[PDB]
Design a protein around this ligand. Structure first.
Ligand SMILES: CCCCCCCC/C=C/CCCCCCCC(=O)O[C@@H](COC(=O)CCCCCCCCCCCCCCCCC)COP(=O)([O-])OCC[N+](C)(C)C
Ligand SMILES: CCCCCCCC/C=C/CCCCCCCC(=O)O[C@@H](COC(=O)CCCCCCCCCCCCCCCCC)COP(=O)([O-])OCC[N+](C)(C)C
Ligand SMILES: CCCCCCCC/C=C/CCCCCCCC(=O)O[C@@H](COC(=O)CCCCCCCCCCCCCCCCC)COP(=O)([O-])OCC[N+](C)(C)C
Ligand SMILES: CCCCCCCC/C=C/CCCCCCCC(=O)O[C@@H](COC(=O)CCCCCCCCCCCCCCCCC)COP(=O)([O-])OCC[N+](C)(C)C
Ligand SMILES: Nc1ncnc2c1ncn2[C@@H]1O[C@H](COP(=O)(O)OP(=O)(O)OP(=O)(O)O)[C@@H](O)[C@H]1O
Ligand SMILES: Nc1ncnc2c1ncn2[C@@H]1O[C@H](COP(=O)(O)OP(=O)(O)OP(=O)(O)O)[C@@H](O)[C@H]1O
Ligand SMILES: Cn1c(=O)c2c(ncn2C)n(C)c1=O
Ligand SMILES: [Ca+2]
Ligand SMILES: [Zn+2]
Ligand SMILES: [Zn+2]
Lengths: 694, 146, 49, 48
């Protein structure tokens, strides 16, 4: 592996048909027999690993202990028609058959899988690197064909990205994707987050912020993977292990509890349909269930208590699953503004940003970067702004002990962490907790869950309050949320047109009070008239209440204008109120909703169209890549796959800095400097070497 | 075929066959496709309509029951909101189909302590159910044509 | 998928499909890794025939 | 009709230069080429 790593280092910054790459191919050809032997070592045991697990092989295994004789092994392998004569004999020699010629094929298959994995992957990378940089060498395809199984095995783990290197050229980087990283990336919650992120940047995002948003998405996704790993499952100590297990259970099953609460709400409201009010006890009336089974009344009490418990568990499930991301994001953006902007050093927000003013409480807290990965943000800010703003003033702002900086760098102290609850009392950063709770209390999702719980408790005072919970279907079902989004999309316009409706009706009221009052007698009685327009407030209410809701406008409600001096004036008043209010203004309200359906629909189409016509990374259209058959499909899955950039960032974090290659160090340095110039923009490997590749 | 055989038991079953024009004529099938294109959304908004009407029923049963006497008779009242199931049916049956919402059907709220509360109940039910929710149903069909 | 298991061993499985030698091709492709006798049992094939 | 007019105006400004009329696709050969072109090379404010 170390020799191959040296060979891969010689290929750093190597152009297509480079002299070093062609020399390396000649070196492999000069030692072709040895290379074939090495490749024949890897595929034989990779094939052996899957053969022993095959159903046909198990038919030969007859020993109850799980062993197999050499003669039985001999007839098992040649029945697969995958190995030759000498190959089977070599496998027999490698098998540690006992004095009874019995072979433990379980350990035999797994004996070399782990020791030879690192070298096998690097050989696959070496052949892949040479093939893509010397594509017109007939001598190299022979090695690729002989290593087809090795390449196929490591295909899901061989990640490749393209970057703009320091040499002002597009370079292709090959790295390793671990099994855990790919498994976590394929989780449905992570995939849903990716779809939401893609929709946001394509719809309401810019080109200059596209890569910075993408990196921020990667940082959030990595943090969420840690949370999922922590909550996953395979006297103080006894309770703590059960407490975290209980909390993890709620975090894992947060959405099922949300569904369960919605189900219980319908069950409670179904029972409430049987309520009946009667003067007689089961001049005040009594409200009681009316059913013959006799089990619904106890069931309502049981469901009401159960619903309250589930709602309470949702809050605990939420603050252990979603709150850490909220704190992580807020700490992340605050730290960068402290360093790269000097938010509380230079600009000092002008009291109109409640978010900025609230974050002042956490600057001097000893545990400010609790969720954010960078634990040395204060150290970095001090080195950047200390000279221009004052080291002692920066330390006071960030709550840093300057005298403690050196002693920590000198040696390390190991104190006594007493596992007592009393010692745990004063170890709580009260100021940080106040800041953290303020962030949680300003979260829309947490406030909704809090309202759901409060309503559940009010349900115990009157059960009818459990009706409010049936609203949850607004966000419980995504189909309704999309439908309701068609109402809230133009919500501001809907409010204004209703306000405009109130003003136009007031103008009609003023005309009526002044000129048409006699026609507003709404009493069939003859000696006591119920005049509806003897007061402006009463007449305005009359127009807004019965006038708007009437099919034919105000004219339907008011007395006939026939045989009267003002008949023509009243026909204009009635027809104009019908047109302007009933016809035009109600069409605007309906028109806004209909237009919202079209506007939301094209946003989905626009996002889908952009993803299938342009690359998310380089921005080059699919038309250019389609010169080569299936060019755009291969480009978005192999060359500029956005998932590989996610994996490459995780690869750099786990890998030791001393082991970073020249290309890896270049990208890693720019990640720490927040410079996204390594992302290819408007260029790709295929475009840079069009003459050589074609 | 089954409906044709049932037609022999009662000839009126032969009416079902007139539905065939849905696929017999391609023009109608395209028109009907504009309804089934957003059929799932149409079902959900009707379900949403049932939930919003239930919330109005709960408010009525609790606070506005006196106004639900639908009997011109004076000694035997036909109270429509003395039971939740009856009151919910009343809102779903006459309330939704009324042009001006529930207010048109129920007794006038004038000269009463809860008059302002009842005007908000009547105007909001007109806006949310008659105006907004029926526009969504019509909006889904219109959007499907586009 | 579960309903199609009834037709795998039927003597006239490719009645309408033009390829009448699908069973022969499947046996040659998966017989070595899954067992020729087990494939024949699954597809209702007589190896001696 | 009014909605697409706003979209058309916004789309044209973000896809073509107001001065030379060359599309953003040509300038995007260079990373952030169109952004620099509309802020440094052919900025309409500089002509003012
Ligand atoms: C008010 C609803 C808030 C949310 C509105 C959305 C829901 C739409 C409609 C829902 C239906 C509501 C049920 C109404 C029927 C209840 C009748 C009743 O019990 O009326 C209650 C009135 O009491 C109350 O008002 C208590 C409620 C406190 C304040 C109510 C406001 C809710 C606060 C909301 C919390 C956060 C809200 C902020 C977010 C805004 C909304 C998102 C009287 O009893 P009762 O004595 O004779 O018996 C009790 C039996 N014993 C007395 C014998 C024990
Ligand atoms: C005379 C013809 C003018 C009517 C033109 C209508 C054009 C729009 C005008 C609207 C306001 C009309 C006020 C007229 C000013 C005074 C007229 C006069 O000389 O007044 C005339 C009476 O003529 C009339 O009856 C005019 C009747 C007007 C009815 C027109 C119906 C149109 C309603 C339009 C509602 C506006 C809402 C628009 C919303 C826009 C949404 C898109 C004689 O008085 P007077 O000695 O008995 O003592 C006034 C009475 N007070 C003692 C109370 C002061
Ligand atoms: C039920 C319709 C099924 C399809 C609905 C879509 C059509 C929309 C409406 C169509 C109009 C239907 C005509 C109703 C009037 C019939 C009155 C009548 O005869 O009512 C019948 C009721 O009997 C029945 O119900 C028999 C029918 C069996 C079950 C009916 C359900 C139909 C089964 C559907 C088969 C597959 C359906 C699955 C797909 C779902 C739909 C796509 C009674 O007689 P009658 O005794 O006095 O005389 C007979 C004269 N002698 C008795 C003297 C002989
Ligand atoms: C008091 C003002 C609160 C009204 C604010 C309305 C805002 C939304 C609230 C809706 C539910 C109202 C319940 C109020 C809680 C109890 C109030 C109270 O203290 O109750 C007050 C009475 O005040 C009232 O009359 C309030 C009347 C509310 C009418 C508001 C009409 C709006 C209808 C909205 C329908 C919701 C559907 C929304 C769908 C959304 C679709 C987009 C005194 O009791 P109580 O001693 O006689 O014994 C309670 C009676 N029981 C014995 C039966 C328990
Ligand atoms: N750089 C890119 N990386 C990945 N996909 C890209 C890129 N540029 C454009 N795309 C397009 O994004 C589309 C979305 O990816 P795709 O649908 O294959 O993802 P998935 O992981 O299989 O799951 P899902 O269907 O949920 O998105 C692809 O069809 C591809 O054409
Ligand atoms: N010649 C040009 N000069 C300026 N902007 C141009 C030119 N051609 C195209 N544009 C586009 O016009 C858009 C509008 O400019 P921009 O939004 O940056 O202006 P502003 O002064 O910051 O304020 P505002 O957001 O109110 O327009 C830019 O995003 C740019 O892409
Ligand atoms: C989690 N994480 C990052 O997400 C990260 C990083 N350096 C840069 N980034 C983006 N480090 C060191 C890190 O631990
Ligand atoms: Ca090194
Ligand atoms: Zn690309
Ligand atoms: Zn220009």
């Amino acid at each position: 592996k170390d020799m191959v790593v040296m060979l891969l280092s010689l290929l750093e910054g190597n152009v297509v048909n480079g002299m070093i790459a062609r020399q390396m191919v000649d070196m492999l050809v000069e030692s072709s027999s040895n290379v074939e032997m090495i490749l024949k070592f890897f595929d034989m045991f990779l094939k052996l690993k899957d053969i022993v697990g095959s159903e046909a092989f198990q038919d030969y295994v007859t020993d109850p202990r799980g062993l197999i004789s050499k003669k039985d092994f001999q007839k098992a392998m040649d029945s697969q028609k995958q190995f030759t004569g000498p190959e089977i004999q070599f496998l027999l020699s490698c098998s540690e058959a006992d004095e009874n010629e019995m072979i433990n094929f379980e350990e035999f298959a797994n004996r070399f899988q782990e020791p030879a994995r690192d070298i096998g992957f690097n050989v696959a990378v070496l052949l892949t690197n040479l093939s893509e940089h010397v594509p017109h060498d007939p001598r190299l395809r022979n090695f690729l064909e002989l290593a087809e199984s090795i390449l196929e095995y490591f295909r899901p783990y061989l990640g490749r990205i393209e970057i703009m290197g320091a040499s002002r050229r597009i370079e292709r980087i090959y790295f390793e994707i671990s099994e855990t990283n790919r498994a976590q990336w394929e989780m449905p919650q992570v995939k849903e987050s990716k779809r939401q992120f893609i929709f946001d940047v394509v719809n309401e995002g810019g080109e200059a912020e596209k890569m910075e948003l993408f990196v921020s998405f990667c940082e959030d996704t990595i943090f969420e993977m840690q949370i999922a790993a922590q909550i996953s499952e395979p006297f103080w100590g006894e309770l703590e292990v059960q407490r975290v297990k209980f909390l993890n259970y709620l975090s894992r099953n947060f959405y099922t509890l949300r569904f369960l609460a919605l189900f219980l709400a319908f069950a409670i409201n179904f029972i409430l349909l049987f309520y009946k009010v009667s003067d007689s006890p089961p001049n005040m009336v009594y409200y009681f269930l009316e059913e013959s089974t006799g089990y619904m009344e106890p069931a309502l009490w049981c469901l009401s208590l159960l619903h309250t418990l589930v709602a309470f568990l949702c809050i605990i499930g939420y603050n252990c699953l979603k709150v850490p991301l909220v704190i992580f994001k807020r700490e992340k953006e605050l730290a960068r503004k402290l360093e790269f902007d000097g938010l509380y050093i230079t600009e000092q927000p002008g009291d109109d940003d409640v978010k900025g003013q609230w974050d002042r409480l956490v600057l001097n807290t000893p545990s400010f970067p609790s969720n954010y990965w960078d634990k040395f943000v204060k150290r970095k800010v001090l080195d950047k702004h200390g000279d221009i703003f004052g080291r002692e003033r920066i330390a006071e702002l960030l709550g840093m002990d300057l005298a403690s900086l050196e002693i920590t760098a000198h040696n390390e102290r190991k104190p006594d962490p007493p596992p007592g609850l009393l010692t745990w009392l004063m170890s709580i950063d009260v100021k940080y907790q106040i800041w953290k709770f303020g962030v949680i209390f300003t979260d829309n999702s947490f406030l909704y869950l809090g309202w759901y719980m409060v309503m559940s408790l009010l349900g115990h005072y009157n059960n009818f309050f459990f009706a409010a919970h049936l609203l949850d279907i607004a966000m419980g079902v995504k189909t309704l949320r999309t439908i309701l989004s068609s109402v809230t999309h133009n919500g501001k316009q809907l409010v204004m047109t209703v306000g405009l409706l109130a003003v136009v009706v007031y103008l009609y009221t003023v005309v009526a009070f002044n000129f048409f009052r006699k026609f507003y007698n709404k009493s069939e009685d003859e000696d006591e008239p119920d005049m509806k327009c003897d007061d402006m407030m009463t007449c305005y209410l009359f127009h807004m209440y019965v006038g708007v809701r009437a099919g034919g406008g105000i004219g339907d409600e008011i007395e006939d204008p026939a045989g009267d001096e003002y008949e023509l004036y009243r026909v204009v008043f009635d027809i104009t109120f019908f047109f302007f209010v009933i016809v035009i203004l109600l069409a605007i309200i309906q028109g806004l909703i209909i237009d919202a359906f079209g506007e939301l629909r094209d946003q989905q189409e626009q996002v889908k169209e952009d993803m299938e016509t342009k690359c998310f990374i380089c921005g080059i259209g699919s038309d250019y890549f389609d010169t080569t058959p299936h060019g755009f499909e291969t480009h978005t899955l192999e060359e500029h796959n956005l998932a590989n950039y996610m994996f490459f960032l995780m690869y750099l974090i786990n890998k030791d800095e001393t082991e970073h290659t020249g290309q890896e160090s270049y990208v890693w340095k720019m990640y720490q400097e927040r410079c996204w110039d390594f992302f290819p923009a408007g260029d790709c490997f295929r475009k840079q070497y069009e003459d050589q590749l074609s």
